[model samples]
Target: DYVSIRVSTLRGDQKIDFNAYVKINDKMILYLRRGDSFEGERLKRLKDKKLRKMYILTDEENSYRTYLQKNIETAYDDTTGKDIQTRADIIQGSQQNNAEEVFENPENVESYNYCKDAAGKYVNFIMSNAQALSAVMNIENTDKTISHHGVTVSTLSIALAQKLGITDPKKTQLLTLGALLHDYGHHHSPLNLNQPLDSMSPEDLALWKKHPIEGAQKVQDKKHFDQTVINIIGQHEETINGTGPKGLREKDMDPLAVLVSSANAMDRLITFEGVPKAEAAKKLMIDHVGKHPLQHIQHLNDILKGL
Candidate 1:
C-alpha cells in the first residue's frame, strides 16, 4: 500500500505500517524530494541551479557595472585636459586655504561624483577592452599613463572575480573601485614617485602607503558610496605573506582586498617596469602565482587571458 498522508497531522504515537512502502525507480527519484533535499546527481543539479540563481540575483540586484558604464561614458565625454588641470588647480589652492571647502563645494562635489561614476564605467569599459588596455600599457607614453592604468586594473580585477566564480556584483564593484583609485593619492603626492623602477625612500614609501587610506576616506565622505568600496580601498595594499604595507595576511583580509592587491601589483609590473605589456603580463603570472596559492593566481590569469 502506498501511503501519501501528510506527516504534520500524524501524532508521534500514531501507528504506521512499515512493511508497505512505495518503491521509486532511481531515474524518477529526483521528483520525490524537494530540489534542495537531494543527494548525488540531484544534489549536483541543485548546486548548479543555486549557482545560476546566485549569478542572476547578483546581476539583477547589484547592476553596479551598468551604472558604472553609464557614468564613465558621461565623464569620459565631458573630460578634457583643461578640466583635469582645473580640478588640480582647485586642489592645490584649497590645500593652502580650506581643504574642507574644496571637497564640499558643489562644483568639487560634482567633479568627484563624475570621478566615482567614471571609475565604475572605466572599469567596465576596460573589462570589455582588455586587449586594447594591454596594448596601451605596452606603449609607454604620457597620453596613456593614468587612464590606461586605471582601465587595466579594473579589467584585471573583474576578470579575476569572474574566473573565481564569484558572482557578487558588490564585490566586483569594490574591486573595480579599489583598482581604479589605488593611485588617487598620486595626484596629490609628488610626480617623481612615478619614475622608472627604483628603490623607494622610507619616507616616500610611507607616504605612498597612505593612498589606500586616503582613497577610503574620500569614498566614505561621499553621500552614496558603498561600504564595500571603503573595505577594498583600505585593504588593497595587503598581501598574502604579511609583507604588504598594512602587514595583513591572506586569511585576515577580505577577498576583494586580495583581488585588488593582485591587480595593482600586476599593473605596476607591466606599466612601470617598461616591460612590453604582453610579455610583462605573462611573466607576472609565472612569478607571482608560483609563490602564491594557485586559486588566487588562476583568477588573475583568467582576467589576463580575457585582456
Candidate 2:
C-alpha cells in the first residue's frame, strides 16, 4: 500500500505535502502528518539513526514525484553542500524507486518513459562527474535487487560505450534504455536472486533461460523501442562462443546486446561474487575470453581499471 522515498532527499524545515510513514516492528505507522514541517532537527536525527528511507501511500505518488521534481535541481546542485558522492547516491536511490515501479508494470508506456528519463539523467550524471563512477559502483545492494542491478548495468554499459567512442546520442540512448531493462523478464520470474543462477534446480534453470526472450517479447509489440533494443533484451544472455540459450555466435549477436552482456557479467562478478573492484574487470577479461567479444573485453578492462 506504500512506496519508498529516500530520506536523504527530503529537505529539512520544509512543509511536507504528503504523509510520511515508517515501519516499526513490520507495521507501517504514520511518522509525519502531511503539511507539517519536516524540521531540521528531526531530519538530522533520522540521518544519525541511519534511516535511509521513508514510506508514503501509493496514491500519493504524484505528490511525491512532483515534490522531487521541484527540488531535484537544488538537491543536485553544489550549492546544496552535498558532496559528489552524496549527490550520486541520492540520484541512485531515486532511480531505484522508479525502477521498482516500472519493473512491477513493464507494459506501461508512461512508466517506461519515466524510467527512460531517469536512466538518461543517471548516464549524464556519471559522464559529467569524475568521482561518480566509483560512487555508483560502490552502492551496496546486499540483497541483490533487480532495480539496482539494472541501473548498475546501464551505468557500466554507457561507460564502456563511451570508452569505445560510441558517442552518437541515439546509440547511447539505445544502450541506456536497453541496459536498463535487460533484466525486465526477472520481474515475472519465480526465482529470486538470493541464489546463484547456476545452482538453481533444472526446472528453474529452464525458466531462467527464457527470461531474455520473455523480456524482449514483453515490450516488442507495445512500445516504440528500436529493433536494436528488442534484440538487446532478447540476446543479452547469448555468449560469444554460441553456448547461450539461443546458441547465437559472436558475429550474429547484436553489438549493443554484447555490450550489455559484458556489463551484466561485470556486475555479477563485482557485486554478487564479491570480487574486489580492482581485480574484477581484469578477472572478467581473463575468465570470459571466449564468452565475449575481444574488443568489448579489452574496452571493459581499460574502462574499469579504476572501477
Candidate 3:
C-alpha cells in the first residue's frame, strides 16, 4: 500500500529506475529482494496478478525525510508560548505522512540513516535540563522500527505529560529516556516485534509478556536513572486493573507510565495492526477505557485529533 509509483503508472519503456518493495505477510518483496523487475516480462507477471498495493523506492521519497527535519526546526522557531503539544503534533504529523517507509525494507540504507539522523536531532533536545521539555518531543524519521517507535511514543508521551502538568525538567528528561527504551526486551523475543502476539505460541507469549519487567531489569542498575524512570519503563505493560503483569493498580502507577503505555499502544495499533489513525484512536478509547485514567486517555484523543 506504499508504492512510490503505482504499478499502472509505470510504463514498460521507461527505466524502472529506483528500487521498489511490497509487503506480503509482513515480509518485503522487491525487485532487488528477488531480482524481479517491475518492468519487462516480470511486469507481465505482476500485471497478471493484479496487485493493489506495494512499498516503493525510498529514493524517490527521500526528500520526505528532509522535509520532516526542516519542519521540526521550523516548529521550534515559532514556539513562543504555544502549547508544546501542538509542536509535537507538527513533528508527528510529518512522521505519520511518511509512515509508508516505517517498516524497514532490507535494501534501503537511506531508511536507517534517516532514522539515525532524526533520532540524533532529538537526542540533542532530550538530553537537556530545559524546563520546556515539550521543546524536545523526540520524533524522528527512520525505518528502524524499534528506534522510530521509541521516538514516536516518546514524543506522544511527553506531549501528554505536559498536558497533565509534569513540569520538572529532570522528570521530562527521564520520561523521554524511559519511553524511548521501553521496548528493550523486544530484542529477546522469539520473533521480531512486528509479528503479532496473537500468532505466537504459549512459550513465546510467556516470553513476550515478561518484556516490560525484562526491559526494566536491563536498565535497573543504570547510574543516572532514578526509580521513577525505571518504573515508567517497567509499568508500560501494566494497567490500573488487576490484569497487568504484576497487578499494578492506581497507587502503584506513574503518570508518565500511564501516558507512555497509551501512546505506545497508539503507534503499534498503526504499525503492527495496520490500523489507520482514525480507527486507532477509537481502539485506544476501548482498550484503555478502564485501564488508564480517563483524563489520560482523553488527552490521547486530543493528541490524535491534532495529529
Candidate 4:
C-alpha cells in the first residue's frame, strides 16, 4: 500500500516513503532525480494532475548542471511567445486617456491591476512548485518586454531565493513584489522616452534614470508592500561602482537588492534586442559571475545556471 519514491543526484540518492502523503483527491508530492528525465506518458500524467508540489532532493550543483545541459534550451523555447507584447499593447492603449481618467477609473487601471494579480499568482505558483517554475523558464518567446519579462524576472528571483534556502514566505513575497514592479516606470513613461537606454539624450537620460524612483513613488504607500520591497525596486539598478542613478555604493545596497539587480539584469541581457535566449543567458552567466566575484555571481548563477 506504500508508494515509495527514490531520488538520485550527483551527490547521491535518497528514498522517501509516501504512504501517508498521498490522498484520494489531494495533491501529490512528486520526487524527481537529477538525471531522470520525465518524458512521454510519464510527463503526460504529471501534466494531467494538479501537482501540489515537487521536491528535487539532490545535489544542487550537479543537478543544476544537468538541467542546464538537458532541459533549459527546450523549456526556454517553449515559453517564448508574443503574449507578453499583446499584454503590453493593451496597457499602452489604456494609457492613451488623460492621466486623471486613467488614474481614477478602475477600468483604466485594470491592466496594471491584472498584471499585479497575475504576478502574485505566478509567484505563489512558483513557490509552491519550484520544479515547474524552473521548467517554464526554459521555454522562450519572441516578445521579451513588460509583462512577460516581469514574470520571468520574478520567477528567477524566487527560484534564486529557494536555491539559497531562504524559505520564509514573507521574504519570498517581498522579493516577488520587487521583481514584478521593477520595470513599472518603463511602462508608465512616454513611448518616445524609451530610446536605446545606452543612447539616451541628456534630458531623456535624466527621466529614464528616475524610473526606479518613480516606481517606488507609485507603490510606496500601497498596502501589503513593505520597505524591503520598495528598497529592492528602487535600488535594483544601483551598481557596485556607483554607476547607478542612485550612486549607492556596493556596500550600501541590500543583499536582496543585489540578487534582484543581478536577476533583472541577467533577464534583460538575455532577452534584450532579440538576442537568442540561450546565448544571452550563457553570456550573462559568463560575464557577470564567471568573470566576477562570488558575491557578484552566486545568486544570479544559482538561478540561471539551470536555464
Candidates sorted on lDDT, descending: 2, 3, 4, 1
Using Cα atoms with residue i matched to residue i, what is each candidate's TM-score against the true structure?
A: 0.54, 0.80, 0.56, 0.54
Q: Where's the lowest-lDDT run of ten residues in candidate 3? A: 97-106
lDDT per residue, candidate 1, 1-307, as tens digits?
Answer: 1223211111111122221112244221212221122212332343233221111123232332343233223323333332332222221111111212223342366554554554454444444443434432332223223433555566567677766777565566656655655555454456444543346677767777787777676666766555666677677777787777678888887777777777777667766655554465566567554433566665555555652
- Among the numbered candidates, top TM-score falls to 2
Model 1 misplaced regions, further than 4 Å? 1-109, 112-147, 195-198, 281-293, 305-307
The candidate with the higher TM-score, 1 or 2, is 2
Q: How would you encode candidate 2's per-residue C-alpha lDDT over 182-257 as one tens digit per residue? A: 8888885677655555667998778889889888888789756567778888999998889888899879988889
Candidate 3, residues 19-86, lDDT tens digits: the string is 56767788777643322323334444654555435566555455434433454665444435445444
Candidate 1 total steric clashes:
1
Q: Where does candidate 4 stray beyond 4 Å?
A: 1-121, 127-131, 138-144, 191-196, 199-204, 285-299, 305-307
User: lDDT of model 1 at residue 273?
Assistant: 58
TM-score of 1: 0.54
User: Model 3, which residues run further than 4 Å from truth?
Assistant: 1-144
lDDT of each: 0.48, 0.74, 0.56, 0.51
Q: Clashes in each model (backbone N, CA, C under 3 Å)? A: 1, 0, 1, 11
User: Considering summed lDDT, which 10 consecutive residues are worst modelled in model 4?
Assistant: 5-14
